[PDB]
Amino acid sequence: EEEILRAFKVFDANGDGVIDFDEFKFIMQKVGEEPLTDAEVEEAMKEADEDGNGVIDIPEFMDLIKKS
């Protein structure tokens, strides 16, 4: 819970428990202006979405890391 909550619960942009692709682009570096490389943000959200919809709740993230 310290490991998985550390990474996903810090990443959760809205504070309700879900992350989307465009809000991942928002939280990527900043709070305001854009300072980017698309490859980092695109690779990270492709690795984290299990369903192909473009949204993530904590249960998805923890299954793709913790399965073993």
From Swiss-Prot:
Query: What's one GO-annotated cellular component?
Result: cytoplasm
Q: Where in the cell is it found?
A: Cytoplasm
Identify the keywords attached in UniProt to this record, alphabetized. Answer: Acetylation, Calcium, Cytoplasm, Metal-binding, Methylation, Muscle protein, Repeat
Where do the annotations place Ca(2+) 1 binding? 12, 14, 16, 23
**Domain EF-hand, residue spans:** 1-34, 36-68
N6,N6,N6-trimethyllysine modification sites?
A: 9, 30
- What GO MF annotations does this protein's record show? calcium ion binding
Give me the residues that bind Ca(2+) 2, please. 49, 51, 53, 60
Q: What is its main location?
A: cytoplasm
Q: What does this protein do?
A: The exact function of this protein is not yet known. It interacts with CAVPT, a protein also of unknown function, in a calcium-dependent way. This protein binds two calcium ions.
Q: This chain belongs to which protein, by name? A: Calcium vector protein
Record the organism: Branchiostoma lanceolatum (Common lancelet)
> What's the source species' lineage?
Eukaryota, Metazoa, Chordata, Cephalochordata, Leptocardii
Segment of the intact protein contained:
88 to 155 of 162
